[PDB]
Amino acid sequence: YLSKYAIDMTEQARQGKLDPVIGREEEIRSTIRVLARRIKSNPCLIGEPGIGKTAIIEGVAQRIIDDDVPTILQGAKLFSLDLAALTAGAKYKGDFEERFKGVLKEIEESKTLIVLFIDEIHMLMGNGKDDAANILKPALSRGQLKVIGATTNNEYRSIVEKDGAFERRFQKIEVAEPSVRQTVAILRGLQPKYEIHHGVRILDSALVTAAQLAKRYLPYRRLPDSALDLVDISCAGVAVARDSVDSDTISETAARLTGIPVKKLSESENEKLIHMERDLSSEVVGQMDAIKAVSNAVRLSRSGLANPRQPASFLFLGLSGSGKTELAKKVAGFLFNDEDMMIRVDCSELSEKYAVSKLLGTTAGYVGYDEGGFLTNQLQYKPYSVLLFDEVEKAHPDVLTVMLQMLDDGRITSGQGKTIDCSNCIVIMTSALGAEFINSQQGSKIQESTKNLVMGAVRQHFRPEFLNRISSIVIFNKLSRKAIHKIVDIRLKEIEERFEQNDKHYKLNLTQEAKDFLAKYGYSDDMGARPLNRLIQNEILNKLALRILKNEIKDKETVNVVLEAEECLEVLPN
Amino acid sequence: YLSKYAIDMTEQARQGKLDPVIGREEEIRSTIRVLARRIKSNPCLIGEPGIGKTAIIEGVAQRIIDDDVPTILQGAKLFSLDLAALTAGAKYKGDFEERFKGVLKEIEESKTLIVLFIDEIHMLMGNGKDDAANILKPALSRGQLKVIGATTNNEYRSIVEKDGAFERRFQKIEVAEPSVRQTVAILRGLQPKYEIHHGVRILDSALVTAAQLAKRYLPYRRLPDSALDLVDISCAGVAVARDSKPEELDSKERQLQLIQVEIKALERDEDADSTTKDRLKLARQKEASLQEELEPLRQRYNEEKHGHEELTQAKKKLDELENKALDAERRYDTATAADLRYFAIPDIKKQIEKLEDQVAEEERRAGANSMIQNVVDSDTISETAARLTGIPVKKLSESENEKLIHMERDLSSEVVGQMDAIKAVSNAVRLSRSGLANPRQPASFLFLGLSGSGKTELAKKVAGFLFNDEDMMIRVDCSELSEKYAVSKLLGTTAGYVGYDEGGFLTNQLQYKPYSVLLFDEVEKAHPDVLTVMLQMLDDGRITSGQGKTIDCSNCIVIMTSALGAEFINSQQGSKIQESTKNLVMGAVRQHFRPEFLNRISSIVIFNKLSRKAIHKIVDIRLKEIEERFEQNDKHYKLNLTQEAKDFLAKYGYSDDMGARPLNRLIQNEILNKLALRILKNEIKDKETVNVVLEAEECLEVLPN
Ligand SMILES: Nc1ncnc2c1ncn2[C@@H]1O[C@H](COP(=O)(O)OP(=O)(O)OP(O)(O)=S)[C@@H](O)[C@H]1O
Ligand SMILES: Nc1ncnc2c1ncn2[C@@H]1O[C@H](COP(=O)(O)OP(=O)(O)OP(O)(O)=S)[C@@H](O)[C@H]1O
Ligand SMILES: Nc1ncnc2c1ncn2[C@@H]1O[C@H](COP(=O)(O)OP(=O)(O)OP(O)(O)=S)[C@@H](O)[C@H]1O
Numbered sequence A: 001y002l003s004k005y006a007i008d009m010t011e012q013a014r015q016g017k018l019d020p021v022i023g024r025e026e027e028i029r030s031t032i033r034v035l036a037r038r039i040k041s042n043p044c045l046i047g048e049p050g051i052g053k054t055a056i057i058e059g060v061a062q063r064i065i066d067d068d069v070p071t072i073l074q075g076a077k078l079f080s081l082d083l084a085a086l087t088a089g090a091k092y093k094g095d096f097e098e099r100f101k102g103v104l105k106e107i108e109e110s111k112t113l114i115v116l117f118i119d120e121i122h123m124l125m126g127n128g129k130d131d132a133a134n135i136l137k138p139a140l141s142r143g144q145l146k147v148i149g150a151t152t153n154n155e156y157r158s159i160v161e162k163d164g165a166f167e168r169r170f171q172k173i174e175v176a177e178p179s180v181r182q183t184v185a186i187l188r189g190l191q192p193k194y195e196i197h198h199g200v201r202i203l204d205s206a207l208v209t210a211a212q213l214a215k216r217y218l219p220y221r222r223l224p225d226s227a228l229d230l231v232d233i234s235c236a237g238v239a240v241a242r243d244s245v246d247s248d249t250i251s252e253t254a255a256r257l258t259g260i261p262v263k264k265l266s267e268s269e270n271e272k273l274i275h276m277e278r279d280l281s282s283e284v285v286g287q288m289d290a291i292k293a294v295s296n297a298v299r300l301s302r303s304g305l306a307n308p309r310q311p312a313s314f315l316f317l318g319l320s321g322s323g324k325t326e327l328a329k330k331v332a333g334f335l336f337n338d339e340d341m342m343i344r345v346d347c348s349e350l351s352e353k354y355a356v357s358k359l360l361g362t363t364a365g366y367v368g369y370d371e372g373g374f375l376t377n378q379l380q381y382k383p384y385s386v387l388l389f390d391e392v393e394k395a396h397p398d399v400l401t402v403m404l405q406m407l408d409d410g411r412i413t414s415g416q417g418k419t420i421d422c423s424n425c426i427v428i429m430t431s432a433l434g435a436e437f438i439n440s441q442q443g444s445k446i447q448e449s450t451k452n453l454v455m456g457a458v459r460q461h462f463r464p465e466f467l468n469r470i471s472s473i474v475i476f477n478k479l480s481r482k483a484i485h486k487i488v489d490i491r492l493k494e495i496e497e498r499f500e501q502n503d504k505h506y507k508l509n510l511t512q513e514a515k516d517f518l519a520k521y522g523y524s525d526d527m528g529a530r531p532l533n534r535l536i537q538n539e540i541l542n543k544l545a546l547r548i549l550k551n552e553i554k555d556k557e558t559v560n561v562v563l564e565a566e567e568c569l570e571v572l573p574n
Numbered sequence B: 001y002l003s004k005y006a007i008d009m010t011e012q013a014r015q016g017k018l019d020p021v022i023g024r025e026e027e028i029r030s031t032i033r034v035l036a037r038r039i040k041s042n043p044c045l046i047g048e049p050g051i052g053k054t055a056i057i058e059g060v061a062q063r064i065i066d067d068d069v070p071t072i073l074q075g076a077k078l079f080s081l082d083l084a085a086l087t088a089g090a091k092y093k094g095d096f097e098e099r100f101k102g103v104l105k106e107i108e109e110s111k112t113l114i115v116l117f118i119d120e121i122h123m124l125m126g127n128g129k130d131d132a133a134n135i136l137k138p139a140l141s142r143g144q145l146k147v148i149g150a151t152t153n154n155e156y157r158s159i160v161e162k163d164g165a166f167e168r169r170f171q172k173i174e175v176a177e178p179s180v181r182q183t184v185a186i187l188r189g190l191q192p193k194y195e196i197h198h199g200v201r202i203l204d205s206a207l208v209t210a211a212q213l214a215k216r217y218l219p220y221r222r223l224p225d226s227a228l229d230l231v232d233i234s235c236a237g238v239a240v241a242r243d244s245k246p247e248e249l250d251s252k253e254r255q256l257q258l259i260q261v262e263i264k265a266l267e268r269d270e271d272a273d274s275t276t277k278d279r280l281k282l283a284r285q286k287e288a289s290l291q292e293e294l295e296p297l298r299q300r301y302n303e304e305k306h307g308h309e310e311l312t313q314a315k316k317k318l319d320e321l322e323n324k325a326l327d328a329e330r331r332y333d334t335a336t337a338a339d340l341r342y343f344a345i346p347d348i349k350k351q352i353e354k355l356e357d358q359v360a361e362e363e364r365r366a367g368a369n370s371m372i373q374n375v376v377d378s379d380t381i382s383e384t385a386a387r388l389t390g391i392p393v394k395k396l397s398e399s400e401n402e403k404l405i406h407m408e409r410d411l412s413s414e415v416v417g418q419m420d421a422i423k424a425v426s427n428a429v430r431l432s433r434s435g436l437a438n439p440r441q442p443a444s445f446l447f448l449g450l451s452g453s454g455k456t457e458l459a460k461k462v463a464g465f466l467f468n469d470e471d472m473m474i475r476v477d478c479s480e481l482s483e484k485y486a487v488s489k490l491l492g493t494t495a496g497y498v499g500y501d502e503g504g505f506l507t508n509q510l511q512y513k514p515y516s517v518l519l520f521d522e523v524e525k526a527h528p529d530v531l532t533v534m535l536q537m538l539d540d541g542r543i544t545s546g547q548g549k550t551i552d553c554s555n556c557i558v559i560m561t562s563a564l565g566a567e568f569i570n571s572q573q574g575s576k577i578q579e580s581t582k583n584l585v586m587g588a589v590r591q592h593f594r595p596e597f598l599n600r601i602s603s604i605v606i607f608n609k610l611s612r613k614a615i616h617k618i619v620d621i622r623l624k625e626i627e628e629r630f631e632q633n634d635k636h637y638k639l640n641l642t643q644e645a646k647d648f649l650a651k652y653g654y655s656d657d658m659g660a661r662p663l664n665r666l667i668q669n670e671i672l673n674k675l676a677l678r679i680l681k682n683e684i685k686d687k688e689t690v691n692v693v694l695e696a697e698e699c700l701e702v703l704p705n
């Protein structure tokens, strides 16, 4: 067997239709340290899939065919003849190894000094630890020549990396995530031929952009692949458009994944974090301090002093006035524009300081399921979520402490091991029980004595590391009387859009006197604070239904109409 | 290859007969752009099957054929195929990958960017791993030519789970489905093609509105398909309706045969002399005469029907050419407008809608053609749906709205006073159905406190009122395990893990009755994995399932069940409930599922203890109840002593907890076998009444004779 599943290349390097992309040369030089390397003749290279681990090996050939490098190994076999020949040898069983053995003689004793390479070590050895690919490999490898595979790390690879045939054999030397600046030098070097065969012409600055931005925000698809897409994405519009710019190639992409790039293309970071801050003021008023308290490590977030792995967040004081938990996540969204952030864990099951039920729960060693599948998964999902807490934590101090780990420091104690990060994750434990002392309010604001003390009563309540680090504060005077009121127009403008504003432009009117009557009643002293939404909607939504029933009128309206006496009964006519 | 059977239609699609699918362009456009990708151009779209989809590819193929593009791109053509054809349609066993080998250079020889493809074929994978052209898959990249297949969502994952590099060497996009309404514009625009098939008139809105409940009444035909079926079935009820005068075909024709044989068979006959010939003459007279009034008349229908079918063929004609006329654009600009001018059309349609105009204009007596050939608004559809479903104009004719507005008074008529409970829900429901919640937000609530309470029935009946359904029904076990819901909810086997089952009551039919009943049960019951799913299950826009991995929550009905009124019931001393009892009731569970879900709750509101002036009615159903349906009038008798009778068992009736539910069984079984007795002998078989008399509790009751 000769050329069939093989990658005949060095020629395609020697004739050179290959397009050089020159990455990190070191591990190659490291790899070059193979040529006569013996004891363990080779390392490996472990990336995630998309990184050109072999494009390296391709670039290696560029390091090779171009010669003027060590000719200690000079004559060449680089070519990977596996493919699927594993099962794809013939019409029946047993020839897989033949399929390589049919390779063996047409690969017989080496004139050409160059070891070749097959893909993964798990493309190597077929399934792994199977006869496929001549499971035992001194005799050729210590023998005519060698080969190389490569993959991503641990488990499947680790198993055969412990002993098997690699007991004597290769290490792994792993290029990084494609780094910062070169990536345009990459990209711009990618430019000329790739961009020359892509379309039109081009200029720098945009090239910088998604580079940053794929690097940004884009752990999945971190690789230029998207730019490489953006590349084709680029010509996509215009070359078409010309058949009959601004990084706005990136825009619709950044529209695609973000939902608008004006979300992604957007407040840059830091001033704009502060602009974010003032836009969160724009969001919700109430204690500016609360805002400002929340504003604190905003700047410290992502900027770092000791680590970004610092958790930066604004420890919550459990209560719900307006933005409260909600906007706290909304801002947390309004950080990343992503509302979704993190869920809540019911701490009910968490009652003790231990259970099989924990945010980790199981270790994944033995039968069961993952408890707290969130950060199990939520990071598998997503970086930089909100968090989840309770005014009485019924949670296990275990994890709380195991998160006091992640609490004080940044990296969290991954139960299964893999603090994939704490980078942008900045969130604040939400607890307070002092409601009856929280009940201490007069006027629009509270002077602090109580707020020291139940604080104190809590300050020592659950032990200090909790209450030790992580400054910022959350304060509740609630709404005094009106100020919340503006929420209505929100509440209003929560309406029309949700489906289509088109449905009803009718936009009505709120007759503050009602909104008073609405609010004054409608939401408790304590809270009672949701329903008027859930409510006033209705009797109105009746008219909605109603005026949608027999249907004489269509307009954009202003309602502003109202009369136990507890009901003056708003309504609205045609 | 020719042997490999290019399905190239770009020829017939040069002839352009299969016609311009619309709306996914933008995708396609960009997808096309994707299909032009410098690096890997091969995505797919995935989802529900069949239907508009290859048509996209075709529509794609159109814009392809439509030329103007980046240079490379119209340097292409295509084909499609089946090796499924060529499976044995090529050769003897072993040839799966066979002809690809030709295809290889066949591709690579001189060939421009021409691309055959077929869709799920890319699955290959009868079972396990085929990989033949997956061998070629790199050899594709070797071949350096796009091809693309298409599957559902369902497959490729497992496949890419098996393959990896597959879509790693590919891309995707996905079925968005057409825009429900605007779908019709196409469908509208489909008519001009589609009409001509069986040419008739068309009334739009029906079709649309048809599509609506077509979709509604039959979801599980995909957004076009169901219409396409209408579209079809339209032509169907049309079809023999385009048999000329099928009734008046055989109806009046008889007048011949009626009087025909006797034209001679009386000529010789044993009758009174010469009156034989008289009846032979006088009916042949009416045979001659009466024939005449329709004798040209039936033709001039059919004539002008032909005149339709004449013009219909011009209707048939015009486009054909117009197609062909616009294929001469593939003749470049040489024959673009040249022919396109020669076809004129100032008039060619000014011909058309002014031609059959008159005969459409002229109404015979009324309605012009009994051919009626046109959209027949539901009718056909009704019939369609009928043939699909049945049940009449009530089921078939409705508005929302109008369908809705009264429901209460009906719903009132259905069970209990609960005017509020009615009203609340009603509204809530009405208010649901209003500008609604968007499919994402669902519709649910709860009563409590009693069994025998009919709120199910209510809802059940509401579903009737909604869906005509007592058909759509859900029974949610909850308490029945904590570790439960393998079966019930998604779990079952949701991983394809072991022994595949899941959504046991649910997933199985869950989807396939999109139109929602649903339950929750008597209390917190067993387990929070409710809260788990009931999160999603309530959570707006819930999409999950086993391996379909999707709820698609549109029709949103559970409301739900639960109850504990134990004290509260008994606590309640009167018909209407005592205030704050509810509040006392409130905390009960609402502590459990907590504001997050309390918010997540739409609302929950419960039934009274409504007793007797109630029951004074309520009993009433039972009589009417059967009778109301019963059979269809075997003999079918009024049979009642009513407030006399009924009360007195209504006296027995109320079980406290259960009411007469047993008595429901126990009422009639009394009366019944006597029916057989009153079936047998010495009887009176009309509608009669009951008898009721009195031991102390032991009471005569029984029946007339
Ligand atoms: N300067 C460079 N040096 C080395 N490799 C590069 C360079 N620029 C781009 N590449 C890689 O070249 C690859 C060519 O495609 P493939 O290698 O098939 O995809 P890949 O997944 O990156 O390769 P693997 O999986 O890492 S071996 C791209 O995916 C890039 O990751
Ligand atoms: N402008 C606002 N005014 C009042 N409440 C708001 C406002 N914006 C959001 N919310 C609330 O944000 C809540 C989510 O955060 P939480 O702090 O948990 O509230 P809560 O603890 O449920 O008690 P509430 O919100 O005061 S009734 C929702 O219940 C909303 O009522
Ligand atoms: N002008 C049009 N605009 C939109 N859709 C159209 C148009 N004309 C036809 N269709 C749809 O095209 C489909 C018929 O082509 P199909 O053969 O079904 O494509 P496809 O083969 O169904 O995709 P697959 O292969 O079945 S999964 C029907 O669903 C029609 O609704």
Ligand SMILES: Nc1ncnc2c1ncn2[C@@H]1O[C@H](COP(=O)(O)OP(=O)(O)OP(O)(O)=S)[C@@H](O)[C@H]1O
Residues within 6 Å of the ligand: B414, B415, B416, B450, B451, B452, B453, B454, B455, B456, B457, B458, B561, B618, B621, B661
């Ligand atoms: N007109 C009616 N009004 C009230 N309840 C009725 C009526 N007709 C029948 N029912 C009973 O109401 C029950 C229907 O379920 P629901 O609406 O939940 O009330 P429920 O009785 O609490 O549920 P059950 O009795 O546990 S099945 C059945 O027991 C029916 O027999």
